[PDB]
From Swiss-Prot, chain D:
Domain of life: Viruses
Protein name per UniProt: Spike protein S2
Resulting phenotype, D47Y: In strain: 19B/501Y, Omicron/BA.1, Omicron/BA.2, Omicron/BA.2.12.1, Omicron/BA.2.75, Omicron/BA.4, Omicron/BA.5, Omicron/BQ.1.1, Omicron/XBB.1.5, Omicron/EG.5.1
Function recorded in the entry: Precursor of the fusion protein processed in the biosynthesis of the S protein and the formation of virus particle. Mediates fusion of the virion and cellular membranes by functioning as a class I viral fusion protein. Contains two viral fusion peptides that are unmasked after cleavage. The S2/S2' cleavage occurs during virus entry at the cell membrane by host TMPRSS2 or during endocytosis by host CSTL.
Lineage: Viruses, Riboviria, Orthornavirae, Pisuviricota, Pisoniviricetes
Shown residues in whole-protein numbering: 750 to 799 of 1273
Length: 195, 249, 249, 50
């Protein structure tokens, strides 16, 4: 925590992220997918929804002739989502797992600082204040080798985990650009069912 | 650390204090009993912003995770990421040039000095939504973007023994002990190598023939000469391939 | 020109747009090519990704070779000296330390190369996808092959990696309008067979969704459904019948 | 510090790797969210078809 294990802050602060997702919302809501290709063109919502129907082979008269029903369905769905999120704490499994993996790695790392690795102590200053240099050299050498190996292992673990996260982030960028900014047809890419 | 007085109720048989990860975090004065904290005073890596030296020589040192009181020394400016010496604050909002953290981006603007400021996200725009308003384009435009994806890399390969123990009997012997530590390395490396050529094969060899375009280039008017290979070239790369092969050194 | 008309028709722009603006699009495409050529020939930082790959590999190699000159605790880093200074009973110890060191350096180098190779392979599979889906076909995965609705692509090699020229398509000049989801002509609605309804204030028109082109409303681009009490925002109009001029004569 | 001055670039290459990780993080978030050039905002009247 304070053995040099700094933590830099993210570049985009959470409020900026919030403004971004709000931008995406308002574009998706007023304009449709057009704000993905060119300049966002307004278009009333029900008409955007009729187009998104006609995208899955359901002639839009379905939509305009069931507007209230579909409206209430969407609202109720939103409500159930709100409750599901607010009740079961285990909905955020993936994110919580990311955080926990990182904290676990860090804690292992910092705990390593207390292991002998074969030395006569782990409190560096003691051997630094107990042994004359001709042997403190040996002890501190062993300690350095050990701690350095541990640090290297930590870096490698971070690297592979980071490759994992980047794979997920590219998947996320894809899902964003293909389902938010448009309407996908890769079946079962964006949720069970026609999208 | 900074020995500050504590309110940790040391039970009268207790001597030291500790934390989650075995860090001394309170003590008892041996001369006169009292319990006080410990916290090691701040550190954090210095970072040196700079515009290109090919433009100026003014730097903007940024101390990381430090309060703007222990920084020994102008125009100090405290931010969320640390103490930022060298840039006058700014009310404006421009895009990011040299990021810092938590929304601080620096620049070299106007008799000039580095400025730090809270970054922007783009000119706020409002869509005039209305339940009977549609906005249909009249005139298109064609663009041409450019995407640059790596495919392969240097198919290196390392002789374990010559590197580790170049040309010595004793070193080859003392390496005969560590078993298969050589062979597995070269195995991994040749795996890398061969899969490099597999990469290239997949990317480019999607076509089963070799086509060639006729001499008459009556392509509706469009002009491909910059991308179609030229015969008079020494190696039959096109023009844009040729620009490309020079940028990379 | 016919391939291009098809590739329009693939993004919902009826080809008559193309065959009626052939010269204009020809000049747009040519000019785009030109700007690309200039951009490549001017800004050396266009090739950032490939340059970074090459530099990473060179850096790795250079630190790997620099490792050879480090003691790691030995009395020297020139193997032959230990081999020409110490009797085997101690050269064993020294060379052992050096071997352990250099071996660990090799090992870390190999691991780094493995991970980087996996990264490059991910990018290469992405490249193969882009080639097979945009060069050899036409994509609809929005923002896969260049911002905008997509038309074609053209590979152009580059040292250890490919480069595309995604010929996308982008609408420019816009016009407010007054849309309405239906038209009640005899109590029974009339939705559009394709594209929105619009009007300029006094006459109601149906048109495409990406290139404003008005069309008077005959009964062949409009299909009936039910009656005009259940729709919201349905607006009255007339929906002409094309067969009357035939029967009256 | 001295006895670590002997192991060559075992210090620099680490921080280099971690810095790569970090800048890559910021690029991650850039790619995910910064898909939109402007910053839009919804009108005050929310008559969204129901």
């Amino acid at each position: 925590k304070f053995n040099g294990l700094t933590v830099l802050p993210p570049l985009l602060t959470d409020e900026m992220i919030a403004q971004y997702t709000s931008a995406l919302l308002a574009g998706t809501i007023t304009s449709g997918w057009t704000f993905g290709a060119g300049a966002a063109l307004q278009i009333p919502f029900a008409m955007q929804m009729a187009y998104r129907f006609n995208g899955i082979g359901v002639t839009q008269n379905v939509l305009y002739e069931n507007q209230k029903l579909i409206a209430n369905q969407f609202n109720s769905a939103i409500g159930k989502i709100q409750d599901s999120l607010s009740s079961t704490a285990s909905a955020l499994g993936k994110l919580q797992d990311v955080v926990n993996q990182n904290a676990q790695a860090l804690n292992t790392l910092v705990k390593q600082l207390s292991s002998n690795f074969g030395a006569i102590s782990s409190v560096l200053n003691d051997i630094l204040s107990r042994l004359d240099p001709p042997e403190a050299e040996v002890q501190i050498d062993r300690l350095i080798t050990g701690r350095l190996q541990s640090l290297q292992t930590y870096v490698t673990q971070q690297l592979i985990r980071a490759a994992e996260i980047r794979a997920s982030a590219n998947l996320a960028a894809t899902k964003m650009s293909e389902c938010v900014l448009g309407q996908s047809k890769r079946v079962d890419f964006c949720g069970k069912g026609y999208h | 650390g900074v020995l500050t007085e504590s309110n940790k109720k040391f039970l009268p048989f207790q001597q030291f204090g500790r934390d989650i990860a075995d860090t001394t975090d309170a003590v008892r004065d041996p001369q006169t009993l009292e319990i006080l904290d410990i916290t090691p005073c701040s550190f954090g890596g210095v970072s040196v912003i700079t515009p290109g030296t090919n433009t100026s020589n003014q730097v903007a040192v940024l101390y990381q995770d430090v309060n703007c009181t222990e920084v020994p020394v102008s125009n100090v400016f405290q931010t969320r990421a640390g103490c930022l010496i060298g840039a006058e604050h700014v009310n404006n909002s421009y895009e990011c040039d040299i990021p810092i953290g938590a929304g601080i981006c620096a620049s070299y603007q106007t008799s000039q000095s580095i400025i730090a400021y809270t970054m922007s996200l783009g000119a706020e725009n409002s869509v005039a939504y209305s339940n009977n308003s549609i906005a249909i384009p009249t005139n298109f435009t064609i663009s041409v973007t450019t995407e640059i994806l790596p495919v392969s890399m240097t198919k290196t390969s390392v002789d374990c023994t010559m590197y580790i123990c170049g040309d010595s009997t004793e070193c080859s012997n003392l390496l005969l002990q560590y078993g298969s530590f050589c062979t597995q390395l070269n195995r991994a490396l040749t795996g890398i190598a061969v899969e490099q050529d597999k990469n290239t094969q997949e990317v480019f060899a999607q076509v089963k023939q070799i086509y060639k375009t006729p001499p008459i280039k009556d392509f509706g008017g469009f002009n491909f000469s910059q991308i179609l290979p030229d015969p008079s070239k020494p190696s039959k790369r096109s023009f844009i391939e040729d620009l490309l092969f020079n940028k990379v050194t | 020109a016919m391939q291009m008309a098809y590739r329009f028709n693939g993004i919902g722009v009826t080809q008559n747009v193309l065959y009626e603006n052939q010269k204009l699009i020809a000049n747009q495409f040519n000019s785009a090519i030109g700007k690309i050529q200039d951009s490549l020939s001017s800004t050396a930082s266009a090739l950032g990704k490939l340059q970074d790959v090459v530099n990473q590999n060179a850096q790795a190699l250079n630190t790997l070779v620099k490792q050879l000159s480090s003691n790691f605790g030995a009395i020297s880093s020139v193997l032959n000296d230990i081999l020409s200074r110490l009797d085997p009973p101690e050269a064993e110890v020294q060379i052992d330390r050096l071997i352990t060191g250099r071996l660990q350096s090799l090992q870390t180098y190999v691991t780094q190369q493995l991970i980087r190779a996996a990264e490059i392979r991910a990018s290469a599979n992405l490249a193969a996808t882009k080639m097979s889906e945009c060069v050899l076909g036409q994509s609809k995965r929005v923002d896969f092959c260049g911002k905008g609705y997509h038309l074609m692509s053209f590979p152009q090699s580059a040292p250890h990696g490919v480069v595309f020229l995604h010929v996308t398509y982008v609408p420019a000049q816009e016009k407010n309008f007054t849309t309405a989801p239906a038209i009640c002509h005899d109590g029974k609605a009339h939705f559009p067979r394709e594209g929105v309804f619009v009007s300029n204030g006094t006459h109601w028109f149906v048109t495409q969704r990406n290139f404003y082109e008005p069309q008077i409303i005959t009964t062949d681009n409009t299909f009936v459904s039910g009656n005009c009490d259940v729709v919201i925002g349905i607006v009255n109009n007339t929906v002409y019948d094309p067969l009357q001029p035939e029967l009256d004569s």
